[PDB]
Curated annotation (Swiss-Prot), chain A:
Subunit structure: The RNAP catalytic core consists of 2 alpha, 1 beta, 1 beta' and 1 omega subunit. When a sigma factor is associated with the core the holoenzyme is formed, which can initiate transcription.
Function according to Swiss-Prot or TrEMBL: DNA-dependent RNA polymerase catalyzes the transcription of DNA into RNA using the four ribonucleoside triphosphates as substrates.
Protein name: DNA-directed RNA polymerase subunit beta
Organism this protein belongs to: Thermus thermophilus (strain ATCC 27634 / DSM 579 / HB8)
Family classification: Belongs to the RNA polymerase beta chain family.
Origin organism lineage: Bacteria, Thermotogati, Deinococcota, Deinococci, Thermales
Swiss-Prot record, chain B:
Catalyzed reactions: RNA(n) + a ribonucleoside 5'-triphosphate = RNA(n+1) + diphosphate
Protein name according to UniProt: DNA-directed RNA polymerase subunit beta'
Gene name tied to this protein: rpoC
Binding site for Mg(2+): D555, D557, D559
Binding, Zn(2+) 2: C928, C1010, C1017, C1020
Record-linked InterPro entries: DNA-dir_RpoC_beta_prime (IPR045867), DNA-dir_RpoC_beta_prime_bact (IPR012754), RNA_pol_asu (IPR000722), RNA_pol_N (IPR006592), RNA_pol_Rpb1_1 (IPR007080), RNA_pol_Rpb1_3 (IPR007066), RNA_pol_Rpb1_3_sf (IPR042102), RNA_pol_Rpb1_4 (IPR007083)
Note on how the cofactor is bound: Binds 1 Mg(2+) ion per subunit. Binds 2 Zn(2+) ions per subunit.
Family the entry assigns: Belongs to the RNA polymerase beta' chain family.
Cofactor dependency: Mg(2+); Zn(2+)
Enzyme class: transferase
Amino acid sequence: GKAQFGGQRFGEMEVWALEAYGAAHTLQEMLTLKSDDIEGRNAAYEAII
Amino acid sequence: KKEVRKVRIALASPEKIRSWSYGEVEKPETINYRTLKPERDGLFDERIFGPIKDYECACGKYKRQRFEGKVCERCGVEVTKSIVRRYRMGHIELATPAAHIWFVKDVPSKIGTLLDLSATELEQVLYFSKYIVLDPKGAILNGVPVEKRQLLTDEEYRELRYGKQETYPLPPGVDALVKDGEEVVKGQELAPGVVSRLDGVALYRFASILVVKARVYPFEDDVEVSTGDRVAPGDVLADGGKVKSDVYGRVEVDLVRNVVRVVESYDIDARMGAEAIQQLLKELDLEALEKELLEEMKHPSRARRAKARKRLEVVRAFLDSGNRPEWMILEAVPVLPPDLRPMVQVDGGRFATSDLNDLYRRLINRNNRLKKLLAQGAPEIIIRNEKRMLQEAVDALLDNGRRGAPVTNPGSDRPLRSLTDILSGKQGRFRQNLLGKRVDYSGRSVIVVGPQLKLHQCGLPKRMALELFKPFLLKKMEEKGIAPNVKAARRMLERQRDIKDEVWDALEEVIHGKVVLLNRAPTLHRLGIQAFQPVLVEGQSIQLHPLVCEAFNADFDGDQMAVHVPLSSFAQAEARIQMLSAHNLLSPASGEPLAKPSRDIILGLYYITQVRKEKKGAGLEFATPEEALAAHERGEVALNAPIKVAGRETSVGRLKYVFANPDEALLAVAHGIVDLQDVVTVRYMGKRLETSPGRILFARIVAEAVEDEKVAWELIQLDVPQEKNSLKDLVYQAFLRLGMEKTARLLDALKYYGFTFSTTSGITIGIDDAVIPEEKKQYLEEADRKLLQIEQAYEMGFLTDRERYDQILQLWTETTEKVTQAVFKNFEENYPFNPLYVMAQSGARGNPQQIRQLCGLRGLMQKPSGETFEVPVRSSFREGLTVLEYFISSHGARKGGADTALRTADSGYLTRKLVDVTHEIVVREADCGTTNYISVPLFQPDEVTRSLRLRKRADIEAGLYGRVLAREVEVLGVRLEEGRYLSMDDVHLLIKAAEAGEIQEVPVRSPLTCQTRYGVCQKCYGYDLSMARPVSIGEAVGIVAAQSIGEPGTQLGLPRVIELFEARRPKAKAVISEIDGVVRIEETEEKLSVFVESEGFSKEYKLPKEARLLVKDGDYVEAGQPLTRGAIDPHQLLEAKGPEAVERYLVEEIQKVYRAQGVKLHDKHIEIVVRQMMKYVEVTDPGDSRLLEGQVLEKWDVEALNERLIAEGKTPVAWKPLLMGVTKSALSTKSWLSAASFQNTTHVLTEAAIAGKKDELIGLKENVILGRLIPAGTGSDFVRFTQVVDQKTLKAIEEARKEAVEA
Amino acid sequence: DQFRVGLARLARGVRERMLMGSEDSLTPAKLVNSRPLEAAIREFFSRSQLSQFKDETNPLSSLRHKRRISALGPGGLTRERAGFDVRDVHRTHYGRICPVETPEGANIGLITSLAAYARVDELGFIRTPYRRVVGGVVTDEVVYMT
DNA sequence: TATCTCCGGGTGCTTGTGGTAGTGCACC
RNA sequence: UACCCAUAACCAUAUCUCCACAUCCACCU
DNA sequence: GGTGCACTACCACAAGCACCCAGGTGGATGTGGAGATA
Ligand SMILES: [Mg+2]
Ligand SMILES: [Zn+2]
């Protein structure tokens, strides 16, 4: 918000469309690696660095 | 290390709660304002939930990494983060039991059904108010027989508890006439003025009288029963066998008169509230109740056995699931970890707190007050009151609103937020963790058109792209020497004053092959997410390729889009291969392309491939005379005949100019000799054509975008203007015959040339372009005259108000169409190149209604009541509307706005219902051994009362295209082998054959008959995709089906779709027949009586005045035939005809409304949702379970297979197929995660907690909830793991294989 | 109305204050305290629904925001959930309520603005001006109808 | 004086309850 | 046991602060 | 042994009640308070 913009809502309709394709890991990364898994996101940031 | 496979939900025992928690909380003291540290044992205590600090303990002696595990010297804290306070849990040991509110207030009262207790009043009144239940002893009589579990008020209870007691003060110093053991009746004069009330014994004191309905017994020997004991008849009281008890009651011995008084109150159970319930649940045994319910169900008729089984299922669930119902009510209440309800300071020391903290504080206060009160003394009424407050506090904590509305401090009338509030609701825990509302590498911005881009690309602002790829940027520029380390690089990028061109070089380096997902906020279908190749641009907006302007519902009136950046290489491959917009050109709802040329490109191509014609004022006869060439060339030299003339056989243009090659023709066009709209003779690859150079250029464009030219020539129609339908067909054919790459290149070339020729062609809208035909003028006059006649027809009284209204409506609606036809006749006759007419003829913009409004008149205008006004609108927007007419049209404008704002909501709800009910269906399968099919008809059974005619081409295409042949068919000398997918060519051939009149029904495979357990097989599903090829195994058909159903709903009638998907009883139900027979119509004036006459019986149906039937007397009638006109209840139809008939009826009825709006939707999706909608059967002949219970058809199939053949015992589990609405099917599912996530978490969770529901992780919603890999898509086992090795290592491993066979 | 609610609160307060009061020479101080009425007025002007932030993007915006008529309000009158029956215009809006000014979105038809020549006379009764027509002459006399 | 402590509207659903006719006990 | 025999103690591993909710006004479907 | 009578199980109707009323984005402003005791 005031400090940083914040992310974008990915809702369910976007989730429904994403799983409507064969996309499987995309949804997994976008639900855990990029959103919620604190250890996961820290490890991902360190690895990509 | 093991993977999660199942999730079990069950009740929690009190010892379970004790095991979970680490310590108990006693103080309702969160945190002092002064001491920012945790206050006490309260809701945020440190040593009860773990340290609040980061890494140090309270003291910090043994903390270091050599010796962190060694117990601390002055302390005892193991090194850990604050995350312990996220997970470590507390508990509260209530001094008094309480019941979970869910099990006592749910619509099926689990407590109220496990015990023979009335839910609405009995359970609460015993559980809150002062009412008493009692098991052991009830044989005491109060004019009422024995009691076993009867509920009696505490007044009459307390009475029967200690006899029948009355006390009367007596004046001291006055010896009343009643002695110590005197029996007294009503009316007996106890004193000069005292009278008793009832038959009993009066006890005398010096100074009191005690009237007890008890029995006195004198005795003169030792006592056998002392004071206090309660006795049964025949038991020795005193003096041995001389005195024995006569009734139930308590014994009191008074040696002053040496007498035993026996009251009539025996020792009986006395209990209130939760403890009582606990006692009941403690003394209840499940097996005996199960057997008793079995006998009470098997013998009697259906009504009682209904509730018998309704409670027997609950009892069986308890017995078979483990957890016993004793801990169904809770003794120790768990306490959530502090970080899940943190008190966070806002500003100025004030702390914002979650209401959970307040609820726990109130509960702690009530519990401590109870403990103190019970410790000190027991004023009974006060004790009961404080028990009630404690109970209400616990109930409020579990959830608020079910009993009153406990609220925050008065002055803020916001009801508190409880656990159930957090779970359920439109925005609860489920509806935000199912969603992942927040993602890291995302952005959003306004979108602008990107026409310079190819279809597989999109423009990305350099600043936001730089921000998005920040870790990639850091690594890539660390690969070079721009910065030494990551911190220096981040600080260099942390301010834009330190940017360098080397930085942008690195940014271009990073994204060379990467893709990003562009997203639009209302994601109606699968195409709302599309991958793209980013191209760095200088600017703020996102550049978007215009051709996806319809894939998204994205215009450029200011709407924004979001962008996401996938990270893993595996996800990059997913997006680039199967989400890239170049690979997704055809709808999943039908084979119609979505990458079709849009409005402007269509306009340009229509302009470039149009032929003009003006006039022929000369003798057009030209076929005959060969002198006519020279003579008519002279005529064109003069003004006798125009160049683009309407000659008899040929125009002078074809005679004058002839071109050797298309290049020569276009070169001569460049010199302004001939316009692109002029037909001329051109020698193409092998033939001479009379075509315009514009059409030749169009053909050359198509042939150059592709490689070969013969294919391009054979896949176009160069004899007609390129209207949007022609372009759509062209794109579809090119996709079919060429593939992906060439279709994309063709689209790019078409877009580019359409833009260029639209620009240079110069189509503009001027006010004079909206020409008003003069003929409509006299039409109005005529209509006006007619109206006058109709009006005088009313003034003579020949017509009613309704009759006049209908006549006027008919007249105006006819003259409107007359005027519109006249307008298009004018346009085609006079001004072929009018921008409005040109836009209407092509698919660019506009409709005949809109053009009529612009130039003609918008006659009929709707009233808010839904009807239409009597006076129409004479003027059009070319002219000026009167103030009154504008005010009238405002009605419809507001109606449209509100209808959008509400029907969008309704359609979204419908789509959510669909996607839930269908999310389990994904094609993982072998070809199921289905020796079954569906016969798609080709003829409409009834367009007239009795007539057969071929169905429309659109319906047949939407029913047959992409289906699989059930069995071999040969119709026109062509052998359509069984198992051959039906392409467009096959469907057109079948339609032509049916037109010739050879076959009427096509046997095809369908999901409706698929025998796959969960999902459908590849064959039974079909052939339609974004591609043409048959479906790949492992892609979610259910979700795409639901999205395809729901997407057109926003742009739409709909309540009919609702009442069809949700199996309901239509108000306008049509009377149907259930038995074969003949029709006997009797025209009784009271109510028309139609008799279905059979050999042994006659059914009689009464039809009111409004019951407009559609059958004739004496007609033969079958089961399920609609006798009257109106909607048909699907349930009675299923009862009459059967499953297949109702399925066909549902599919056709749903398709009817979608067609009525012009939407093209395939029937695979409706079939899929219908199959999921009636996958349930209710067993009638019992097997190893109760009868009147409904569950999965597949499970009963498996059980029957096991019972009859696999195991011995020929017990037929005879069922009936049950049809229920979409909602009930979605709710009642084997998995509880989805059902809890869908509609009502409370009831679903309660049901799934009564019996331990081990939720299997099938279906996509559960795997999304837990966050694990989806079973569908790439997660399907058929392709889940696929070993990959190169050829050289293959040769190495295979050499190891051949030498593995030694010697 | 908010003032009189606060005033009634103050009246109950002074009733109690007299109730436990003993002597009589206490008129100004021991009777009336300003906290209730002042707090009520401040709350109405700050946290009410209809006292909303001014839209001063341009003079026209401010004028329209100042002459906007809302159907919802304190809460017991109409709410956002269900109003579909009344969102549509009426035959009487002619000359009193603009049938076009309504804002698109959820608050459609609920929020509107009165016409230019509209005038509330004394009690929320919008009066449209009309010229008196006597026989065949149109008089300059202008009279306001409800 | 400063701080600590009492002060729905609409739909479908379920259930219920009186009604209503099949069938069990008494006049033919 | 004392030569062997008797030994156990001291320091370096990080994504967070607040953003909650309510009310209101707008924008895009 | 069979019909008049009473009865009780079953269906249509009326009332009480829980639950619906789409997705995302930006901005703005509001927050334990009165009495009582020390
Ligand atoms: Mg837009
Ligand atoms: Zn199949």
